[PDB]
Amino acid sequence: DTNIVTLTRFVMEEGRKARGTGEMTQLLNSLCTAVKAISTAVRKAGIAHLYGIAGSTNVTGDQVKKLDVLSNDLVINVLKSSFATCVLVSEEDKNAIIVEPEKRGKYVVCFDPLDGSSNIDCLVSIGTIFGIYRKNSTDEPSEKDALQPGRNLVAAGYALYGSATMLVLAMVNGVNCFMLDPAIGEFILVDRDVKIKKKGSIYSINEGYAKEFDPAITEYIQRKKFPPDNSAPYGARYVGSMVADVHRTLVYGGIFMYPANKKSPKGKLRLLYECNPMAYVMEKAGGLATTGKEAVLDIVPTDIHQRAPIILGSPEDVTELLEIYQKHAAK
Ligand SMILES: O=P(O)(O)OC[C@H]1O[C@](O)(CO)[C@@H](O)[C@@H]1O
Ligand SMILES: [Mg+2]
Ligand SMILES: [Mg+2]
Ligand SMILES: [Tl+]
Ligand SMILES: [Tl+]
Ligand SMILES: [Tl+]
Ligand SMILES: [Tl+]
Known about the structure:
Layout: H1 7-17, H2 23-43, E1 53-57, E2 63-65, H3 66-81, E3 85-90, E4 97-98, E5 104-115, E6 126-134, E7 153-161, E8 165-171, E9 174-181, E10 186-191, E11 202-204, H4 215-225, E12 235-236, H5 242-252, E13 255-258, H6 271-284, E14 288-290, E15 310-313, H7 315-328
Parallel strand pairs: 3-5, 11-12, 11-13
Antiparallel strand pairs: 1-2, 3-4, 5-6, 6-7, 7-8, 8-9, 9-10, 13-15, 14-15
The chain binds 6-O-phosphono-beta-D-fructofuranose (F6P), magnesium ion (MG) (2 copies) and thallium (I) ion (TL) (4 copies).
6-O-phosphono-beta-D-fructofuranose binds near residues 115, 117, 206, 241 and 268.
EC number: 3.1.3.11
Pfam families: FBPase, FBPase_C
Cofactor: Mg(2+)
């Protein structure tokens, strides 16, 4: 009651014995501020007329919504002001953003300011995704500082604007969930050291793409619906917002899939600010995250807006699908 374990307190105490300049706390405190401001706009978006498009398109091809602009501006401004960052990569910006010398700190942040664009207008859960790297280079900060493999992440996670607003944060020792208290505008710890189940009973994929799926995905799905051992078939869930489907995978277990297909060699989701952050969360929770052929966190990106296939969740479910890919593997 009068001893609130806030996100700030947790990350300060975490980074205590480990020493540190304390800019990670600065960064996350700043991010939390933009997340609250996004949550409040979202929760009254119809009244504030924030539905509808902005009138523009993303890089490879994406219709930019009003809340994309708002959330993008908020995240960039708070990150800059935090004095903790030097390079920013956003889904909404064609090029990396370089922070001004005076406000530069040591971190590189890749983010999706608003994830779940197709679900905005129907009031389904949407979110914010981020991954944070330490700049390694010694030269002037540049776009290349963002082109690190996922395994180099120091922290990653997401905000979920669902039935409640939740900040899920993964760092080297594990995953923790903080719920926004709307009364005092603080993220409070509600789930400690989260670990995903070894095996789940939900599969999550858009079967609208059945016609384009590779034979391994096709086989796996058939197996969920017609188990060979007479076990009960898996239930299906696909909210359509990566943050919502991945969060459910984390807390209920199971598998989430956005694979490569006949029209999309690399899938749809973006490696730097969608796939890597979630793969990292999953791995810190004891889960797996693969493209079907390689670990997502091991990919070395060459494009900040690069796409990747992703299959993640409970280790025994992801493994079962890898076995099918392996079985189908060819010259
Ligand atoms: O409509 P589709 O192709 O299933 O795409 C849904 C995916 O697209 C995204 O909106 C990309 O931002 C994800 O949040 C989501 O998982
Ligand atoms: Mg977005
Ligand atoms: Mg997204
Ligand atoms: Tl977008
Ligand atoms: Tl969006
Ligand atoms: Tl995407
Ligand atoms: Tl995207």
